[PDB]
């Protein structure tokens, strides 16, 4: 299926994924389209940050769901 990821710019990209895909697979599939390593990327879906090890279906991600990609401003 085809979901939406909203990059750092704000531009919307598309990803082909099955609902059985782990978040790591989704992050790795962002890496091929955007170049961002899976380490540095955080995914947010309706306020819940996505967790490595769960799958898209566990968060009820369906066609046309928009995932928000953000990074980490670390701090002290």
């Amino acid at each position: 299926m085809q979901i939406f990821v909203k990059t750092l710019t704000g531009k919307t990209i598309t990803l082909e994924v099955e609902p059985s895909d782990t978040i790591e697979n989704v992050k790795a599939k962002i890496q091929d389209k955007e170049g961002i390593p899976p380490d540095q990327q955080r995914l947010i879906f309706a306020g819940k940050q996505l967790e490595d090890g769960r799958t898209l279906s566990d968060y009820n991600i369906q066609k046309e769901s928009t995932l928000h990609l953000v990074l980490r401003l670390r701090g002290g």
């Binding site: 909203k6 919307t12 306020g47 002290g76």
Partner: protein
């Protein structure tokens, strides 16, 4: 000092935590709800809601800096994780989701969504084929694009404007195969308490490093957002007031977090840097944190707002309603006093997970 307010002890890297705690503590309506959470039967070495009532009680009563020691313990964290630097917004999304889950089933069930959640729409229209799809999302914050945008208003426009799903990102029309389309996003509702995350970073794959955006970005004291709603309400305009400015200083690897606040909703502001609380001007809290500021004693170049908190004019007497001891249950009060008395007698994860 004549701030009356007290800061938080920093266990090592916990400024991101301290800055958030203040922001939430002064979200009054929220602080009340935390107080009324059933915890008599909870285990303090493991209860996050308990440790929060604890930090909120001492931030309200103590005239000495509050320790956040037990709060990390309730995360299921060891001492080392208190020396890890984290994104303040990442904490916000993990903590609030954890807590909303614990409030489920109690009397204060779903208090968090009532304050922070809104809705929006995502319209897709194929350019060549008559095919129109609609989807709707909830949000507890908004990611505002920063690079190239003067201020909050422009950043909203780019958020709500019409994008192009062209070439390598065609929309799956199922029957009609792949299709060039146009996506546009209108806001349906705006929450009583608005969390804004300023996308102050990017990543270049050609160079392979992520950079902090220290550019200038302007945010007003009053934020009329009615224009970005799909249907407006006359009895409730989408007018917001600045409440908190979460400030990250440093760029790239390092960091340090602070929060500026006018808790009571007045014009008086205060700077909460960990245990130190000091009064300050509006300019010190707003204009100084615009970023792109040239490294002077009054303001450093790599110091700028990363999260903003806005409260709807309409629902603002409600959100910032006063917190007395009348709103604190007696059963809580006793448990913390007994904790005091017994005390007198006497790879590292870089991903910020809460385990309880």
């Amino acid at each position: 000092k004549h701030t009356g307010y007290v800061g938080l002890k920093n266990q090592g890297a916990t400024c991101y935590m301290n800055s958030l705690l203040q922001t939430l503590f002064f979200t009054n309506q929220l602080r009340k709800a935390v107080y009324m959470m059933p915890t008599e039967g909870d285990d303090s070495s493991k209860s996050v809601p308990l440790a929060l009532q604890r930090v909120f009680y001492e931030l309200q009563h103590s005239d000495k800096p509050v320790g956040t020691k037990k709060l990390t313990k309730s995360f299921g964290w060891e001492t080392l994780d208190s020396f890890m630097q984290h994104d303040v917004q990442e904490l916000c999304r993990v903590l609030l989701d954890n807590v909303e889950n614990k409030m489920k089933g109690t009397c204060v069930e779903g208090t968090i969504p009532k304050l922070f959640r809104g809705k929006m729409v995502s319209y897709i229209q194929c350019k060549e084929v008559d095919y129109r799809s609609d989807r709707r999302e909830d949000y507890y914050d908004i990611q505002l694009s920063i690079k190239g945008k003067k201020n909050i208003f422009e950043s909203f426009v780019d958020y709500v404007a019409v994008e192009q799903l062209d070439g390598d990102n065609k929309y799956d029309a199922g029957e009609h195969g792949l299709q060039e389309a146009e996506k546009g996003v209108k806001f349906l509702t705006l929450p009583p308490v608005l969390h804004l995350q300023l996308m102050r970073f990017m990543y270049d794959p050609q160079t392979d490093q992520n950079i902090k955006i220290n550019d200038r970005f302007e945010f007003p004291e009053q934020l009329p957002l009615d224009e970005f709603l799909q249907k407006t309400d006359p009895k409730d305009p989408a007018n917001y007031i600045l409440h908190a400015v979460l400030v990250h200083s440093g760029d790239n690897h390092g960091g340090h977090y602070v929060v500026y606040l006018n808790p009571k909703g007045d014009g008086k502001w205060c700077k909460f840097d960990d245990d130190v609380v000091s009064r300050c001007t509006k300019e010190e809290a707003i204009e100084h944190n615009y970023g792109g500021h040239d490294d002077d004693l009054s303001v450093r170049h790599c110091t700028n707002a990363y999260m903003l908190v806005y409260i709807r004019e309409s629902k603002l007497s409600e959100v910032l309603q006063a917190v007395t001891d009348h709103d604190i249950p007696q059963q809580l009060v006793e448990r913390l006093q007994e904790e005091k008395r017994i005390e007198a007698q006497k790879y590292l994860e870089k991903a910020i997970k809460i385990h309880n």
